[PDB]
């Protein structure tokens, strides 16, 4: 029939529901069909940023290029700027979780201190600042209290529950070079005592570093 713009919506909605029902390469194609369809509409006034969000979701769902996936969540928030407050505040989460995944933890506070993001204050932007602060001081126990405080918005999203376990490994070795740094030969019984973690798993994890 006549329309073209509503085809973009139903292809984007199928792109939601193959990913959330755990089928990535079928969700990859249904996104691309919405990519090649939205390239012909003269006015995508608001649906562009809605497509720009899951242009970043599925492209970060395989974790190949976080830098270009960060560029999608920026534009999806620029399109959500000052016109749609529920969709905008979640767009702060996907850019700064990516930035901690990018391992530039100080730049998280540099954005939210910016005057465009000073307006969108709330609970979930504080859920990112504490975790960025936890990865800033580079400690395991600093990460744990930030999870337990803001669990209602941190450990609730269906992609965060996937991306926390990969971030935990990176911050495990980030505190592990921190405490090991100031010395020479040392015992293994103290580094387990200074991380509050076991000895057999640490020793294998230490062995992976020198390999």
């Amino acid at each position: 029939m006549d329309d073209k713009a509503l085809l973009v919506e139903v292809q984007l909605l199928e792109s939601k529901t193959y990913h959330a029902l755990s089928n990535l390469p079928k969700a990859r194609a249904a996104l691309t069909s919405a990519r090649t369809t939205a390239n012909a509409i003269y006015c995508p006034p608001k649906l562009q940023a809605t497509l720009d969000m899951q242009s970043g979701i599925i492209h970060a769902a395989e974790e190949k290029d976080w830098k270009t996936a960060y560029s999608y969540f920026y534009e999806a928030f620029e399109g959500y700027d000052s016109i749609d407050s529920p969709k905008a505040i979640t767009s702060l989460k996907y850019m700064l979780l990516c930035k901690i995944m990018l391992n530039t933890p100080e730049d998280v506070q540099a954005l939210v201190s910016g005057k465009l993001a000073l307006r969108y204050a709330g609970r979930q932007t504080e859920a990112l600042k504490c975790v960025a602060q936890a990865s800033k001081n580079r400690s395991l126990a600093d990460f744990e209290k930030a999870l337990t405080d803001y669990r209602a918005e941190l450990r609730d999203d269906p992609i965060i529950s996937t991306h926390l376990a990969k971030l935990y490994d990176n911050l495990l070795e980030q505190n592990l070079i921190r405490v090991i740094e100031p010395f020479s030969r040392v015992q293994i019984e103290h580094i387990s005592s200074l991380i509050k973690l076991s000895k057999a798993d640490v020793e294998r994890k230490l062995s992976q570093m020198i390999l």
Binding site: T32, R35, T36, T37, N39, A40, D65
Partner: protein, 40 residues
């Protein structure tokens, strides 16, 4: 337009910092070059 598309397919590959041109870049290139065909 064939040399218009096949040159422009590199511009999609270069704007996402790839080094190989892929089959989804060509079909994204058709919908823009034929869009200008649909303009006047």
């Amino acid at each position: 337009e064939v040399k218009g598309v096949c040159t422009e397919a590199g511009m999609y590959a270069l704007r996402e910092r790839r080094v190989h041109v892929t089959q989804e870049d060509f079909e994204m290139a058709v919908a823009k070059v034929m869009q200008k065909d649909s303009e006047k």
